[PDB]
Structures are given as structure tokens and as C-alpha cells.
Design a protein around this motif. Structure first.
Motif, PDB file in Angstrom:
ATOM      1  N   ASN A 156      40.705  30.136  37.303  1.00  0.00           N
ATOM      2  CA  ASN A 156      41.595  31.018  38.285  1.00  0.00           C
ATOM      3  C   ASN A 156      41.516  32.766  38.205  1.00  0.00           C
ATOM      4  O   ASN A 156      41.358  33.526  39.076  1.00  0.00           O
ATOM      5  CB  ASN A 156      43.230  31.005  37.925  1.00  0.00           C
ATOM      6  CG  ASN A 156      43.416  29.609  38.286  1.00  0.00           C
ATOM      7  OD1 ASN A 156      43.043  28.499  37.123  1.00  0.00           O
ATOM      8  ND2 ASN A 156      43.958  29.020  39.230  1.00  0.00           N
ATOM      9  N   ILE A 157      41.040  33.093  36.927  1.00  0.00           N
ATOM     10  CA  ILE A 157      40.987  34.735  36.403  1.00  0.00           C
ATOM     11  C   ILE A 157      39.924  35.204  37.301  1.00  0.00           C
ATOM     12  O   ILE A 157      39.646  36.053  37.970  1.00  0.00           O
ATOM     13  CB  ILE A 157      41.081  35.293  35.046  1.00  0.00           C
ATOM     14  CG1 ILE A 157      42.461  34.772  34.720  1.00  0.00           C
ATOM     15  CG2 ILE A 157      40.643  36.688  35.130  1.00  0.00           C
ATOM     16  CD1 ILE A 157      42.157  34.793  33.013  1.00  0.00           C
ATOM     17  N   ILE A 158      38.686  34.369  37.182  1.00  0.00           N
ATOM     18  CA  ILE A 158      37.408  34.759  37.696  1.00  0.00           C
ATOM     19  C   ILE A 158      37.529  34.883  39.150  1.00  0.00           C
ATOM     20  O   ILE A 158      37.154  35.643  39.928  1.00  0.00           O
ATOM     21  CB  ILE A 158      36.038  33.906  37.242  1.00  0.00           C
ATOM     22  CG1 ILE A 158      35.956  34.287  35.832  1.00  0.00           C
ATOM     23  CG2 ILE A 158      34.912  34.135  38.057  1.00  0.00           C
ATOM     24  CD1 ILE A 158      35.045  32.991  35.132  1.00  0.00           C
ATOM     25  N   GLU A 159      38.281  33.789  39.752  1.00  0.00           N
ATOM     26  CA  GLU A 159      38.171  33.592  41.121  1.00  0.00           C
ATOM     27  C   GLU A 159      39.107  34.539  41.975  1.00  0.00           C
ATOM     28  O   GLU A 159      38.942  35.080  42.934  1.00  0.00           O
ATOM     29  CB  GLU A 159      38.480  32.230  41.476  1.00  0.00           C
ATOM     30  CG  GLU A 159      37.463  31.102  41.326  1.00  0.00           C
ATOM     31  CD  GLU A 159      37.903  29.800  41.661  1.00  0.00           C
ATOM     32  OE1 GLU A 159      39.223  29.473  41.922  1.00  0.00           O
ATOM     33  OE2 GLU A 159      37.188  28.692  41.792  1.00  0.00           O
ATOM     34  N   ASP A 224      56.075  30.372  32.836  1.00  0.00           N
ATOM     35  CA  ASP A 224      56.065  31.748  33.146  1.00  0.00           C
ATOM     36  C   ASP A 224      55.333  31.793  34.469  1.00  0.00           C
ATOM     37  O   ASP A 224      54.470  30.931  34.948  1.00  0.00           O
ATOM     38  CB  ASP A 224      55.216  32.453  32.209  1.00  0.00           C
ATOM     39  CG  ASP A 224      56.222  32.836  31.221  1.00  0.00           C
ATOM     40  OD1 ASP A 224      57.367  32.635  31.089  1.00  0.00           O
ATOM     41  OD2 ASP A 224      55.672  33.610  30.133  1.00  0.00           O
ATOM     42  N   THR A 225      55.522  32.942  35.383  1.00  0.00           N
ATOM     43  CA  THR A 225      54.377  33.395  36.500  1.00  0.00           C
ATOM     44  C   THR A 225      53.846  34.446  35.795  1.00  0.00           C
ATOM     45  O   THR A 225      54.191  35.454  35.595  1.00  0.00           O
ATOM     46  CB  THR A 225      55.570  33.519  37.520  1.00  0.00           C
ATOM     47  OG1 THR A 225      56.368  32.691  37.821  1.00  0.00           O
ATOM     48  CG2 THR A 225      54.483  33.694  38.748  1.00  0.00           C
ATOM     49  N   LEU A 226      52.462  34.202  35.814  1.00  0.00           N
ATOM     50  CA  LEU A 226      51.299  35.051  35.528  1.00  0.00           C
ATOM     51  C   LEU A 226      50.929  35.796  37.189  1.00  0.00           C
ATOM     52  O   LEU A 226      50.498  34.901  37.726  1.00  0.00           O
ATOM     53  CB  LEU A 226      50.408  34.501  34.831  1.00  0.00           C
ATOM     54  CG  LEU A 226      50.927  33.691  33.533  1.00  0.00           C
ATOM     55  CD1 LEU A 226      49.669  33.188  32.846  1.00  0.00           C
ATOM     56  CD2 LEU A 226      51.565  34.623  32.638  1.00  0.00           C
ATOM     57  N   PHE A 231      46.857  39.426  34.809  1.00  0.00           N
ATOM     58  CA  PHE A 231      45.395  39.425  35.415  1.00  0.00           C
ATOM     59  C   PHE A 231      44.873  40.510  35.257  1.00  0.00           C
ATOM     60  O   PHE A 231      43.597  40.723  34.601  1.00  0.00           O
ATOM     61  CB  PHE A 231      45.499  39.021  36.993  1.00  0.00           C
ATOM     62  CG  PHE A 231      44.346  39.516  37.705  1.00  0.00           C
ATOM     63  CD1 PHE A 231      43.166  38.529  37.645  1.00  0.00           C
ATOM     64  CD2 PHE A 231      44.124  40.394  38.525  1.00  0.00           C
ATOM     65  CE1 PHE A 231      42.169  38.842  38.201  1.00  0.00           C
ATOM     66  CE2 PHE A 231      42.890  40.551  39.229  1.00  0.00           C
ATOM     67  CZ  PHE A 231      41.800  39.803  39.228  1.00  0.00           C
ATOM     68  N   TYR A 232      45.076  41.767  35.532  1.00  0.00           N
ATOM     69  CA  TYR A 232      44.639  43.116  35.352  1.00  0.00           C
ATOM     70  C   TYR A 232      44.389  43.272  33.727  1.00  0.00           C
ATOM     71  O   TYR A 232      43.466  43.793  33.330  1.00  0.00           O
ATOM     72  CB  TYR A 232      45.366  44.192  35.935  1.00  0.00           C
ATOM     73  CG  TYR A 232      44.981  44.315  37.373  1.00  0.00           C
ATOM     74  CD1 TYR A 232      43.726  44.171  37.895  1.00  0.00           C
ATOM     75  CD2 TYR A 232      45.970  44.176  38.428  1.00  0.00           C
ATOM     76  CE1 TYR A 232      43.531  44.300  39.365  1.00  0.00           C
ATOM     77  CE2 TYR A 232      45.795  44.163  39.601  1.00  0.00           C
ATOM     78  CZ  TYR A 232      44.531  44.166  40.187  1.00  0.00           C
ATOM     79  OH  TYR A 232      44.446  44.344  41.437  1.00  0.00           O
ATOM     80  N   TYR A 239      35.444  39.534  31.595  1.00  0.00           N
ATOM     81  CA  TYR A 239      34.371  40.132  31.744  1.00  0.00           C
ATOM     82  C   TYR A 239      33.473  40.149  30.571  1.00  0.00           C
ATOM     83  O   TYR A 239      32.313  39.790  30.387  1.00  0.00           O
ATOM     84  CB  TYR A 239      34.377  41.678  32.290  1.00  0.00           C
ATOM     85  CG  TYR A 239      34.795  41.680  33.697  1.00  0.00           C
ATOM     86  CD1 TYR A 239      34.482  40.650  34.822  1.00  0.00           C
ATOM     87  CD2 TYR A 239      35.681  42.650  33.966  1.00  0.00           C
ATOM     88  CE1 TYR A 239      34.954  40.723  36.009  1.00  0.00           C
ATOM     89  CE2 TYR A 239      35.953  42.799  35.735  1.00  0.00           C
ATOM     90  CZ  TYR A 239      35.715  41.813  36.569  1.00  0.00           C
ATOM     91  OH  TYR A 239      35.925  41.555  37.682  1.00  0.00           O
ATOM     92  N   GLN A 240      34.097  40.665  29.537  1.00  0.00           N
ATOM     93  CA  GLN A 240      33.212  40.818  28.160  1.00  0.00           C
ATOM     94  C   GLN A 240      32.829  39.290  27.930  1.00  0.00           C
ATOM     95  O   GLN A 240      31.628  39.164  27.311  1.00  0.00           O
ATOM     96  CB  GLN A 240      34.401  41.302  26.980  1.00  0.00           C
ATOM     97  CG  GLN A 240      33.566  41.216  25.519  1.00  0.00           C
ATOM     98  CD  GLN A 240      34.644  41.368  24.257  1.00  0.00           C
ATOM     99  OE1 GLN A 240      35.046  42.567  24.241  1.00  0.00           O
ATOM    100  NE2 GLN A 240      34.874  40.417  23.663  1.00  0.00           N
ATOM    101  N   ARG A 241      33.538  38.283  27.622  1.00  0.00           N
ATOM    102  CA  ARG A 241      32.993  36.905  27.506  1.00  0.00           C
ATOM    103  C   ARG A 241      31.927  36.282  28.085  1.00  0.00           C
ATOM    104  O   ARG A 241      31.038  35.611  27.748  1.00  0.00           O
ATOM    105  CB  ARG A 241      34.173  35.755  27.340  1.00  0.00           C
ATOM    106  CG  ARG A 241      35.270  36.538  26.222  1.00  0.00           C
ATOM    107  CD  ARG A 241      35.043  36.610  24.860  1.00  0.00           C
ATOM    108  NE  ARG A 241      34.703  35.390  24.018  1.00  0.00           N
ATOM    109  CZ  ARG A 241      33.881  35.268  22.995  1.00  0.00           C
ATOM    110  NH1 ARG A 241      33.573  36.270  22.274  1.00  0.00           N
ATOM    111  NH2 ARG A 241      33.881  33.962  22.470  1.00  0.00           N
TER     112      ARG A 241
END
Ligand SMILES: *[C@@H]1O[C@H](CO)[C@@H](O[C@@H]2O[C@H](CO)[C@@H](O[C@@H]3O[C@H](CO)[C@@H](O)[C@H](O[C@H]4O[C@H](CO)[C@@H](O)[C@H](O)[C@@H]4O)[C@@H]3O)[C@H](O)[C@H]2NC(C)=O)[C@H](O)[C@H]1NC(C)=O
Ligand SMILES: *[C@@H]1O[C@H](CO)[C@@H](O[C@@H]2O[C@H](CO)[C@@H](O)[C@H](O)[C@H]2NC(C)=O)[C@H](O)[C@H]1NC(C)=O
Ligand SMILES: *[C@@H]1O[C@H](CO)[C@@H](O)[C@H](O)[C@H]1NC(C)=O
Ligand SMILES: [Zn+2]
Ligand SMILES: [Zn+2]
Ligand SMILES: [Zn+2]
Length: 258
Positions: A156-159, A224-226, A231-232, A239-241
Motif C-alpha cells: 500500500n505505501i508504494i502504491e 487505527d486509520t493510517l 504515509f509521509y 524508499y531507503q529499503r
């Protein structure tokens, strides 16, 4: 990682191969790949049941603490030592050392496994707690959708970043990661590539659990709602990983085939 993460890692890696590694990879890839390592960097996920012995090789389970030890943690559900993503990386890198030598294993599979597993060992929640199945049992919302925390890190984070900045495709993200590898993180990149042994998976796993505790699990409660804040703040770690994974996959293949 899901599809996008592995594609990114493998695209970065293939462009960082030296001539001998690039040649070996082209030779070991099937014709159907059309020379593109990234077209097969999800192959391992598709053989989780076809090769049931391979499913534990995608991750590492640890106790409820922020540390990883090979001897303690690298083992599967029957306690068989080595059967975790770190152990798999050692296995398949060793197999690839046999390419073109005078001396049993399918080295196309070895390449596809090491490519995928080098990616997975960089997903923080692939080196995390057995008690929550690497975050798979932590059910939250990613904005408007229900999702578990593991899936948020795999995909989800990447997308969401793809949609935010890169028009819902990975090419722009790949080029931005490559840009930073050259101009922002050059010093770091040299350290990422350094390994005195094949490969240095235990180093990568130790980073991963630290990221799991500091960034993935941190502040998150069931239900929780993330949203933007999470996200930010977590995007830079993703990105680092991804960059580390790509850089280290290339460096490892370069060492193996050199
Ligand atoms: C290193 O890479 C290699 C190559 O991919 C990989 O070797 C594979 O190991 C698995 C076992 O871990 C082998 O699978 C077994 O195959 C035999 C016969 O061929 C079967 O009899 C086995 O079935 C029994 O054992 C299972 C337990 O593993 C039980 O669950 C099951 O009910 C049966 O009792 C089993 O399927 C596979 O054949 C090899 N392949 C090769 C080419 O050697 C190895 O595991 C990797 N190790 C890592 C990454 O640590
Ligand atoms: C080495 O391993 C690869 C991947 O398992 C084999 O390629 C597969 O072959 C099967 C059966 O012929 C096909 O169904 C797939 O299309 C192939 N997959 C890929 C990714 O190419 C290859 O045959 C193996 N070599 C051996 C056993 O000698
Ligand atoms: C690249 O680095 C810059 C400066 O630190 C940063 O603003 C940007 O988010 C980074 N992009 C990626 C893909 O890591
Ligand atoms: Zn993955
Ligand atoms: Zn995953
Ligand atoms: Zn996987």
C-alpha cells in the motif's frame, strides 16, 4: 514486498550489474524474460505451494523484541536451522558460485530466488514478530480501506506513493530512487554494497527489525486509520529499503559472478 517493490528492486539492480554479471544474468534468464530480470522477480511468490518447502524462506520470525540473531531466529516452524530468508540468501548465493565451474541445482531458480529474497529481506515486516505474523494479524485501515499492517508495507505505501507523485506507475519512482542513489546517498550506497563474506543477509535483517520497531509497528494500534501522517513519515524508510535492496542485489550478483 508485493509486485511493485520487487520490480523496483530488480530494475535498480539490473542497471547496476557489471559486464560479467550482466552477461551471466542474461544467460540464466529464460528467453521468455526478454533479458529483463524484473519480469521474474515475483516468481518465488508463485511457488510458495508448488514448492511448499520454500514458503518459510520469504521471512524471519523473531520474539517480541527489536533484535535479530541468526542462530535464534533463522529456522522454520519445525525448528530446522537455516530455513528463513537469510538462510535462503546464503543457500542460493552459494549455488550461483557454481556457475560455469568444473565440479545438481537449477541455477535459473537460484537466480530468481536470490533476486526475490534479497528484496524480501529488506521489507521491514519480513523480519519481525512471530506473535503478529509479521504484522499480518494487525488489522487497520489504509485511508478508506481495511488492510493489515504487513500488506501496507508490502504494497500500500508504494502504491499510494506511485499515485501521489508518479502517476500510478513505478518508472518515475525508479528514476527518483536511482537519482538519489547517485546524488543524495552516494556515501551510504558504498556502505550498503560492502560485504566481506557472497552476501551479508544478517546485516540486512538486523536493519529490518529495527525499522519494524521504529517505523512500521511504532504508534500503530489494531483498528487505527493510517493516513497522511503515517504515509509521509514512513515513505522515506520504504524508499531507503527499496534502494538498499536494489543496490545490494546488484552488489551480490557482481561478487558472485566475478
Ligand atoms: C537450497 O536450495 C534448494 C534448491 O531449491 C532447496 O532444496 C530443496 O529442499 C527441499 C526440502 O527443503 C526439497 O523438498 C523435498 O523433496 C523431497 C524429494 O525430492 C521430498 O521427499 C520432500 O518431501 C518430504 O519432506 C517435506 C519437508 O521438507 C515434508 O513436508 C513432506 O511432507 C515430505 O515428508 C520435500 O518435498 C527439494 O527437493 C530440494 N530441491 C533440490 C533441487 O535439492 C533447499 O531447501 C534450499 N535451502 C534453503 C534455502 O535453506
Ligand atoms: C529450471 O527452473 C526453471 C523454473 O522452474 C524451469 O523453467 C520452467 O519450466 C517449466 C516446465 O518446463 C515451465 O512450466 C515454466 O514455463 C518454466 N519457468 C520459467 C520461469 O522459465 C526450467 O525448466 C528449469 N530447468 C531444468 C529443470 O532443467
Ligand atoms: C530523494 O532525496 C530527496 C532529498 O533528500 C528527497 O526530497 C526525496 O524524497 C528523495 N526521493 C526518493 C525516491 O527517495
Ligand atoms: Zn516480497
Ligand atoms: Zn510480505
Ligand atoms: Zn516473498
Amino acid at each position: 514486498w508485493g509486485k511493485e517493490g520487487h520490480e523496483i528492486i530488480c530494475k535498480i539492480a539490473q542497471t547496476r550489474l557489471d559486464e560479467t554479471a550482466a552477461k551471466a544474468v542474461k544467460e540464466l534468464l529464460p528467453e521468455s524474460a526478454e533479458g529483463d530480470l524484473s519480469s521474474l522477480c515475483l516468481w518465488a511468490d508463485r511457488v510458495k505451494f508448488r514448492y511448499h518447502w520454500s514458503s518459510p524462506l520469504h521471512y524471519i520470525n523473531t520474539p517480541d523484541a527489536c533484535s535479530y540473531q541468526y542462530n535464534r531466529d533463522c529456522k522454520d516452524e519445525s525448528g530446522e536451522k537455516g530455513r528463513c530468508v537469510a538462510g535462503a540468501i546464503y543457500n542460493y548465493t552459494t549455488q550461483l558460485l557454481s556457475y560455469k565451474t568444473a565440479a545438481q541445482y537449477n541455477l535459473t531458480e537460484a537466480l530468481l530466488f536470490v533476486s526475490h529474497f534479497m528484496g524480501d529481506i529488506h521489507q521491514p515486516l519480513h523480519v519481525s514478530y512471530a506473535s503478529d505474523k509479521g504484522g499480518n494479524t494487525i488489522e487497520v485501515h489504509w485511508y478508506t480501506r481495511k488492510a493489515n499492517l504487513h500488506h501496507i508495507w508490502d504494497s500500500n505505501i508504494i502504491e499510494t506513493a506511485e499515485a501521489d507523485l508518479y502517476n500510478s506507475a513505478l518508472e518515475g519512482m525508479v528514476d527518483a530512487l536511482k537519482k538519489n542513489i547517485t546524488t543524495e546517498w552516494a556515501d551510504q550506497v558504498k556502505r550498503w554494497e560492502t560485504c566481506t563474506k557472497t552476501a551479508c543477509p544478517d546485516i540486512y535483517a538486523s536493519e529490518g527489525i529495527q525499522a519494524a520497531c521504529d517505523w512500521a509497528y511504532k504508534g500503530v494500534t489494531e483498528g487505527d486509520t493510517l493516513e497522511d501522517e503515517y504515509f509521509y513519515s514512513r515513505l522515506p524508510i520504504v524508499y531507503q529499503r527499496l534502494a538498499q535492496g536494489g543496490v545490494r542485489l546488484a552488489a551480490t550478483l557482481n561478487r558472485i559472478f566475478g
